[PDB]
Amino acid sequence: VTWEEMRDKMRKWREENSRNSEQIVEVGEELINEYASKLGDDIWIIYEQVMIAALDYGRDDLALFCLQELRRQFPGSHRVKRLTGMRFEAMERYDDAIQLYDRILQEDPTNTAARKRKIAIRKAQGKNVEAIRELNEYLEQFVGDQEAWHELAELYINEHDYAKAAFCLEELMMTNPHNHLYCQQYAEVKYTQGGLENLELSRKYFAQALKLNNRNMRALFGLYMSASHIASNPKASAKTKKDNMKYASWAASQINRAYQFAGRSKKETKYSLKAVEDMLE
Amino acid sequence: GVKLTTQAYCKMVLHGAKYPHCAVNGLLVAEKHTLFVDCIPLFHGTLALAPMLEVALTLIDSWCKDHSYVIAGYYQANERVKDASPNQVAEKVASRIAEGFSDTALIMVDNTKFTMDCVAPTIHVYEHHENRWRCRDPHHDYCEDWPEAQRISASLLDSRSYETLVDFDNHLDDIRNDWTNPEINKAVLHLC
């Protein structure tokens, strides 16, 4: 347990957007308290996360410390300005944060952080419709922002506009053809959206996600259930009926295999057996 | 008339603490004033997706009827602090689970009252009558042993057991993670 090890863990925990605020804030505090001088400026980005985790963790005591250090180090910095805005938002102080973000925008118009933080404020305030409108307007100048694109898709799903969510997921997949998560999510959205005209898309995209990752057993039984629903649907043609029945049977075989592997891996009660008892039904 | 066990309340707090930033949901199973003997969590964050909910409900029904229980309640903790009303997802899920047994009523973890020790009952129980869902009396007793629920929730949270808690979503990630989460059950037994 050396500071390099926790440093690497924090770097990884930053590389992938995790939200275990407790663990990351503890590790960052240990690094900046014990091994602050053991490494150079690489803790400075940590000083960001440490406060954000704090704002997520509610422990605001060290948020002021990190903010003051960053501000005293980086005067007149847009990054530190957005960070102060988040600090303000930590206590639902929205007017001052909005004013700060507006000042950042008038100081720099191409900045996207201010727009994201202000729409985050709007969605924290519960104005979901205006948040969707703000994201649509912001994208109109910044088409291609995957994070905002996915956020708008999630907001539409929460608000239940599966058509717009499906469209956003389609363009997101356009951005990332190789991400099986987008394919699985779009298949789910299309299945939730409607019937056979979307059940076919859901099963096709579930198969694509499985192709992109064989371990995505979530999407596996999602394809299984989509095929089963298509089979149960009277509107399925005879050839479509047998095709989706074959898909469901193959998916069920894969599910039994997957649960058998889940069985051989662990040593406990045969819940996997009960699971395939469900599938056989 | 909705009654849930203390282990149900501690599971409520455990799942709320596990994903404090993300709205969560799940079901409560009981044997055939219904007493929710056990609970089970499922998913978090995005909750409006149907396929996961359907596959879940199917697995819940299979697991419960295999072990003599039947699903008889639905729980949901919202993401927003100032949100305590059911959404469309919660309403439809509660209606569908209540379609089997009329005694099934929805419960929502009011995150506004979510604290370390859970001083006040966070869960609010909503009944379906007149084709509408409305809350019961907040002043009603919800847990079977309120001081026991308070102490066990405080001990479990202070013991960092929320990180160890596993819901259906982790099972979806990997079946090796036990979705039946008997670990929290044995912790409850030891604490009690």
Binding site: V129, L135, N136, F167, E171 | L57
Partner: peptide, 26 residues
């Protein structure tokens, strides 16, 4: 299917790039 729950219903400017009408242009 005993759990065929429907989650559609109310759909609530439009997201940029979106066009609701199904056009057969090809």
């Amino acid at each position: 299917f005993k759990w065929a729950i429907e989650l559609s219903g109310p759909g609530g400017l439009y997201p940029v790039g979106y066009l609701d009408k199904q056009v057969p242009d090809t």
